[PDB]
């Protein structure tokens, strides 16, 4: 769910899901349309095409299990839902720590027109 990605986020990266990652670049929070911005854009767009494999899945109210293996997220049994999307919210986790080097704030309440365009996942 929603608010398990933000604390999976914030555990990862030591910054608050909302508003470091809710309105960032093309794809985060509301991603669309466009060429992602950076990597870390580009780490929602792939979260939202991991979500998108999953058209019959909830994956901003079903809850999903994940415990920490020394650090490791590791995504514990639950539907298959709930494995898939505990799956791209630990991909999109990590990916967001991969990148922190280029997180940029300027792109923190990107404006919609400046995201054109349809890429395909
Ligand atoms: C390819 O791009 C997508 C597609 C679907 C998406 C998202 C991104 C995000 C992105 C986000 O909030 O990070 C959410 C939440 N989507 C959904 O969950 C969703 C769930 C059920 C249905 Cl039936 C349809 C869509």
């Given at each position: 769910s929603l608010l398990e990605f933000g604390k999976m986020?914030?555990?990862?990266?030591?910054k608050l899901?909302?508003?470091s990652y809710?309105?960032?670049g093309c794809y985060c929070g509301w991603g669309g349309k466009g060429t992602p911005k950076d990597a870390t854009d580009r780490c929602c767009f792939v979260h939202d095409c991991c979500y998108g494999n999953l058209p019959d899945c909830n994956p901003k109210?079903?809850?999903?299990?994940?415990?920490?293996?020394?650090?490791?997220?590791?995504?514990?049994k639950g539907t298959s839902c709930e494995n898939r999307i505990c799956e791209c919210?630990?991909?999109?986790?990590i990916c967001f720590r991969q990148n922190l080097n280029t997180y940029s704030k300027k792109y923190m309440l990107y404006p919609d027109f400046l995201c054109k365009?349809?890429?395909?996942?």
């Open positions: 986020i914030l555990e990862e990266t030591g899901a909302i508003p809710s309105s960032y109210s079903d809850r999903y299990k994940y415990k920490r293996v020394n650090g490791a997220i590791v995504c514990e919210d630990k991909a999109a986790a365009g349809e890429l395909k996942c």
